[PDB]
Amino acid sequence: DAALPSWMPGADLPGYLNGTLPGDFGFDPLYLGQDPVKLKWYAQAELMNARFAMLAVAGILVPELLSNIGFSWPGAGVAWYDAGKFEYFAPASSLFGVQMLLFAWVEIRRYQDFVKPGSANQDPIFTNNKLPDGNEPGYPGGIFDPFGWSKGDIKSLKLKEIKNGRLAMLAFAGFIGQAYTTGTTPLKNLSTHLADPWSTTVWQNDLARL
Amino acid sequence: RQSWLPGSQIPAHLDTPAAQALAGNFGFDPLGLGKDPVALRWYQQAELIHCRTAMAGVAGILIPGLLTKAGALNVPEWYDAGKVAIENSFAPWGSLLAVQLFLCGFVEAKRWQDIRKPGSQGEPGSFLGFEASLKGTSELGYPGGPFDPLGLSKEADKWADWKLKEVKNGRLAMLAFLGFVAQKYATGAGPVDNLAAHLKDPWHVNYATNGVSLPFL
Amino acid sequence: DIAGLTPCSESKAYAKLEKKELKTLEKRLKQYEADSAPAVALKATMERTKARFANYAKAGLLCGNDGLPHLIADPGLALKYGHAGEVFIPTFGFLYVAGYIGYVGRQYLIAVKGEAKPTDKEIIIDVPLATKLAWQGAGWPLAAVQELQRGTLLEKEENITVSPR
Amino acid sequence: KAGNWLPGSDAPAWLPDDLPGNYGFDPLSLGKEPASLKRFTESEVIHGRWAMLGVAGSLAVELLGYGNWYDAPLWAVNGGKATWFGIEVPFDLNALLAFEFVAMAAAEGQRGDAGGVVYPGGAFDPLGFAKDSSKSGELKLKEIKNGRLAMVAFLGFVAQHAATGKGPIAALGEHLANPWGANFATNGISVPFF
Ligand code: CLA
Ligand code: CLA
Ligand code: CLA
Ligand SMILES: CC1=C[C@H](O)CC(C)(C)[C@H]1/C=C/C(C)=C/C=C/C(C)=C/C=C/C=C(C)/C=C/C=C(C)/C=C/C1=C(C)C[C@H](O)CC1(C)C
Ligand SMILES: CC1=C(/C=C/C(C)=C/C=C/C(C)=C/C=C\C=C(C)\C=C\C=C(C)\C=C\C2=C(C)C[C@@H](O)CC2(C)C)C(C)(C)CCC1
Ligand SMILES: CCCCCCCCCCCCO[C@@H]1O[C@H](CO)[C@@H](O[C@H]2O[C@H](CO)[C@@H](O)[C@H](O)[C@H]2O)[C@H](O)[C@H]1O
């Protein structure tokens, strides 16, 4: 509600969005972050869902692109939605069991910081090890920023993080929809479009499926 | 003031500050059942227990049903699950119900006595040292203590929102159970089938075409 | 089953009564032309008779040696043997309607009593108020218990007139 | 304070600093009332002492090839006789039940009438050990920690058997044989689906 960037040039934006969070373009048509305590939780949520979505999309597209090329390895042409039934060294169940244990420790360590900032910046075992005092929930830094990037224009870097994440979160949503609708991998869906974009729009595809 | 019917006259007994302190107060009491404050307090407790039981039961009918529809589960339909479970149980239904009434009656009596006099179950020396925790909070129907293991009720800036979600989700689950009973008698199928069938042809598959709900049309 | 009675569905007297009833209606249906309005009416009564004898038997009513349905009024026998729609359920249906009328009328008398001329509101009915109470009477049972528990339902003896004794 | 069970959390004030095993863990506020905390303190030590003997004898029998803790009473349920270290014990369940009841009621009655004495002495503390408070404190911390560990161990034994139906040593062998194939997530009980 000032002169900060807007999702719709000329609109009256919500005052609660004041440009303190990265990517504050005043977009809250349903007035969800109007309450400050909800907005505080939603900021971390958006950052967490974005950071996993960014890793996911990378780990979904890179292997497919390598598969198209001559790159050889166990996965090869394994479709992301078919990776679960793939046979690995250990039973899925076992792996999941380990994953939930390992994550219980890290999530509750991250959650402790969020509820009390700077309360989990110390190594439980090697007490001497720790994270620099200056810390905000969602931005642990220290050994999580091993190259010092945070030191430079941190605000621009945080905006690049939120922007790339929102696109990744939308990409994953695409992968889910396009996979269930076109029943094929994303880079295959892109090849179909690049071959004949005009005749390969969701409109025509869904019309044919009707 | 939110109203169940914009423009209608809200009962004065629901506009009183104490009544407005109650979660889900949309000024709805057309029959005037809660005009008496003492009755309004009993009915608020009754609504909370119905809400929390309906939410647990409906979750135990829909969630398993969707998982079975997918395949992750093979649970029988809610209206056939008693027979299936008792078929291979360690006890007949009558013995299982007798044990249920004993254990439920005991905890229901303690909750009852807490309504008659809040904090009474903390009577020192009444429960091998647990009575101290058996005392609820300043709000009847919200015991907390051991019943709030994660201490979410300790955040005063989120208390009201949490109670509104519990009452609204509870009122919805109460209506979803009535719907499960009515739809079972009018269709002869389960709630997940009823949903799929309607979604296939909503304009020809509904309660107006069930041959029961509207015997006049 | 109970009292030595027999299901109307298996009673021979029940069957003979239905035939006897339909034969009277048929002896009369003859003197009339097939489409004649008299004929149509006798046919609809015959259909209604057939449905009654069938509906009563399906309801599991018991029949005495007279071949007529007998009603079981013991709550214990009715519930254990499937005869609760005969007297038990009807009892709670009537009690709800009768209490409805009583509680609404009591609420009306109490409301008009605080007016200028209660007697006038008894000869000329305050329709709007009467309609309001009529709709609010659905929850009378809970209201009656809440009044019984507040001690507001009854009147103090000290305020009620009596003869010298 | 022996430590913080949850780093970054503040200890409940009602928990005394000297209280042995005080890791500031009372999230449900059960020990908030002093009387309640007193009873729970004694009960916790008693539970730990019993469990530390139960775990020991539950592992010993199996390690000595005398069977597992779960199958130890089946002799009574069947027509089998009672054995101990292989040596046969001539007693029916009824005899054992009556003997234990009287023995337990007697000793437990003396302990109960005493008044919550968690740390007696003399007969219960021969070989000195708890004569000096300085040693007593650490020795009381070691007892509670070993007792709590043994209580979690026993529950693990009961849970593992309820899911696999095998003895505690037999499981340790299965897991060591195939850790990624033999674990709680690979039993079809602990983790649903899969
Ligand atoms: C940045 C996200 C993103 C991107 C780049 C794409 C890209 C593509 N999608 Mg798509 N999709 C997305 C998200 C996305 N999708 C989401 C969130 C959904 C809903 C779950 C879908 C559901 C979907 C279906 C059902 C289909 C596609 C299809 C396609 C392909 C061409 C046909 C088409 O345009 O359909 C239309 C796609 C949309 C209308 C989604 C809008 C695009 C999102 C909202 C980005 C917003 C626009 C913004 C300016 C960014 C542009 C991208 C940027 C890199 C320039 C194409 C390569 C078709 C296909 O598979 O081809 C074979 C197809 O049938 N998508
Ligand atoms: C108001 C007058 C009245 C009268 C004269 C009766 C008479 C009778 N009742 Mg009864 N009953 C009544 C009111 C009455 N009832 C009411 C208001 C209720 C609602 C709770 C019931 C509920 C009831 C049940 C559940 C049962 C009976 C049964 C019976 C028969 C045997 C009961 C008995 O032993 O002594 C007479 C009973 C009373 C004077 C008062 C109530 C009945 C008691 C409480 C039931 C005890 C029955 C007992 C198990 C004996 C039968 C053993 C076995 C055959 C079940 C008997 C002819 C039993 C029967 O025959 O079922 C097949 C049966 O089990 N009644
Ligand atoms: C508000 C109306 C009302 C109510 C609540 C009652 C209530 C009662 N009456 Mg009663 N009575 C009424 C009207 C009413 N009466 C009228 C209009 C008459 C004149 C006929 C009588 C004549 C009467 C007699 C002779 C006796 C009772 C008796 C009784 C008591 C025993 C139960 C009973 O109902 O017996 C049965 C009562 C009746 C069969 C009378 C039927 C009256 C109709 C059905 C009520 C309609 C009232 C009015 C038209 C509704 C106005 C609604 C408003 C919105 C406009 C009971 C407390 C008995 C008693 O004293 O027991 C202790 C008793 O012997 N009443
Ligand atoms: C407020 C008002 C006021 C004004 O004045 C008037 C009026 C209007 C009257 C009023 C209204 C009212 C209403 C609406 C009510 C409703 C209610 C309900 C529906 C409830 C439910 C309620 C419901 C509930 C509880 C539920 C419960 C359930 C459960 C437990 C479950 C169970 C189960 C399951 C799991 C499964 C299996 O297999 C089976 C079973 C066994 C079955
Ligand atoms: C609330 C209400 C009213 C009622 C007011 C008052 C005070 C009514 C008084 C009720 C009193 C004092 C009743 C006293 C005793 C009643 C008793 C002992 C009950 C007897 C019933 C029995 C034995 C049951 C018999 C059976 C049952 C189970 C049902 C059927 O199966 C039939 C049968 C006989 C087998 C107002 C104002 C008239 C207005 C209106 C609504
Ligand atoms: C009808 C069959 C089923 C019911 C069986 C009932 C069995 C008998 C009653 C249950 C056992 C009672 O258990 C009882 O617990 C209390 C708890 O303080 C013990 O009480 C003990 O400690 C307290 C102080 O802490 C003392 O005041 C008490 O004098 C002392 O004995 C009793 O010693 C014990 O006997």
TrEMBL record, chain A:
<feature type="binding site">
    <location>
        <position position="85"/>
    </location>
    <ligand>
        <name>chlorophyll b 3</name>
    </ligand>
</feature>
<feature type="binding site">
    <location>
        <position position="164"/>
    </location>
    <ligand>
        <name>chlorophyll a 15</name>
    </ligand>
</feature>
<feature type="binding site">
    <location>
        <position position="106"/>
    </location>
    <ligand>
        <name>chlorophyll b 8</name>
    </ligand>
</feature>
<feature type="binding site" description="axial binding residue">
    <location>
        <position position="51"/>
    </location>
    <ligand>
        <name>chlorophyll a 2</name>
    </ligand>
</feature>
<feature type="binding site" description="axial binding residue">
    <location>
        <position position="166"/>
    </location>
    <ligand>
        <name>chlorophyll a 4</name>
    </ligand>
</feature>
<feature type="binding site">
    <location>
        <position position="110"/>
    </location>
    <ligand>
        <name>chlorophyll a 7</name>
    </ligand>
</feature>
<feature type="binding site">
    <location>
        <position position="123"/>
    </location>
    <ligand>
        <name>chlorophyll b 7</name>
    </ligand>
</feature>
<feature type="binding site">
    <location>
        <position position="161"/>
    </location>
    <ligand>
        <name>chlorophyll a 12</name>
    </ligand>
</feature>
<keyword id="KW-0472">Membrane</keyword>
<dbReference type="GO" id="GO:0009522">
    <property type="term" value="C:photosystem I"/>
</dbReference>
<feature type="binding site">
    <location>
        <position position="109"/>
    </location>
    <ligand>
        <name>chlorophyll b 2</name>
    </ligand>
</feature>
<keyword id="KW-0934">Plastid</keyword>
<feature type="binding site">
    <location>
        <position position="41"/>
    </location>
    <ligand>
        <name>chlorophyll a 4</name>
    </ligand>
</feature>
<feature type="binding site">
    <location>
        <position position="178"/>
    </location>
    <ligand>
        <name>chlorophyll a 1</name>
    </ligand>
</feature>
<feature type="binding site">
    <location>
        <position position="107"/>
    </location>
    <ligand>
        <name>chlorophyll a 6</name>
    </ligand>
</feature>
From TrEMBL, chain B:
<feature type="binding site">
    <location>
        <position position="100"/>
    </location>
    <ligand>
        <name>chlorophyll b 4</name>
    </ligand>
</feature>
<feature type="binding site">
    <location>
        <position position="166"/>
    </location>
    <ligand>
        <name>chlorophyll a 11</name>
    </ligand>
</feature>
<feature type="binding site">
    <location>
        <position position="206"/>
    </location>
    <ligand>
        <name>chlorophyll a 19</name>
    </ligand>
</feature>
<feature type="binding site">
    <location>
        <position position="166"/>
    </location>
    <ligand>
        <name>chlorophyll a 12</name>
    </ligand>
</feature>
<feature type="binding site">
    <location>
        <position position="169"/>
    </location>
    <ligand>
        <name>chlorophyll a 13</name>
    </ligand>
</feature>
<feature type="binding site">
    <location>
        <position position="165"/>
    </location>
    <ligand>
        <name>chlorophyll a 1</name>
    </ligand>
</feature>
<feature type="binding site">
    <location>
        <position position="165"/>
    </location>
    <ligand>
        <name>chlorophyll a 13</name>
    </ligand>
</feature>
<feature type="binding site">
    <location>
        <position position="144"/>
    </location>
    <ligand>
        <name>chlorophyll a 11</name>
    </ligand>
</feature>
<feature type="binding site">
    <location>
        <position position="183"/>
    </location>
    <ligand>
        <name>chlorophyll a 1</name>
    </ligand>
</feature>
<keyword id="KW-0603">Photosystem I</keyword>
<feature type="binding site">
    <location>
        <position position="108"/>
    </location>
    <ligand>
        <name>chlorophyll a 6</name>
    </ligand>
</feature>
<feature type="binding site">
    <location>
        <position position="207"/>
    </location>
    <ligand>
        <name>chlorophyll a 17</name>
    </ligand>
</feature>
<feature type="binding site">
    <location>
        <position position="210"/>
    </location>
    <ligand>
        <name>chlorophyll a 16</name>
    </ligand>
</feature>
<feature type="binding site">
    <location>
        <position position="47"/>
    </location>
    <ligand>
        <name>chlorophyll a 1</name>
    </ligand>
</feature>
<dbReference type="InterPro" id="IPR022796">
    <property type="entry name" value="Chloroa_b-bind"/>
</dbReference>
UniProtKB/TrEMBL annotation, chain D:
<feature type="binding site">
    <location>
        <position position="77"/>
    </location>
    <ligand>
        <name>chlorophyll b 4</name>
    </ligand>
</feature>
<feature type="binding site">
    <location>
        <position position="28"/>
    </location>
    <ligand>
        <name>all-trans-violaxanthin</name>
    </ligand>
</feature>
<dbReference type="GO" id="GO:0009535">
    <property type="term" value="C:chloroplast thylakoid membrane"/>
</dbReference>
<keyword id="KW-0812">Transmembrane</keyword>
<keyword id="KW-0809">Transit peptide</keyword>
<comment type="function">
    <text>The light-harvesting complex (LHC) functions as a light receptor, it captures and delivers excitation energy to photosystems with which it is closely associated.</text>
</comment>
<keyword id="KW-0597">Phosphoprotein</keyword>
<keyword id="KW-0157">Chromophore</keyword>
<feature type="binding site">
    <location>
        <position position="143"/>
    </location>
    <ligand>
        <name>chlorophyll a 19</name>
    </ligand>
</feature>
<keyword id="KW-0602">Photosynthesis</keyword>
<feature type="binding site">
    <location>
        <position position="146"/>
    </location>
    <ligand>
        <name>chlorophyll a 24</name>
    </ligand>
</feature>
<feature type="binding site">
    <location>
        <position position="164"/>
    </location>
    <ligand>
        <name>chlorophyll a 26</name>
    </ligand>
</feature>
<feature type="binding site">
    <location>
        <position position="146"/>
    </location>
    <ligand>
        <name>chlorophyll a 23</name>
    </ligand>
</feature>
<feature type="binding site">
    <location>
        <position position="83"/>
    </location>
    <ligand>
        <name>chlorophyll a 12</name>
    </ligand>
</feature>
<feature type="binding site">
    <location>
        <position position="160"/>
    </location>
    <ligand>
        <name>chlorophyll a 25</name>
    </ligand>
</feature>
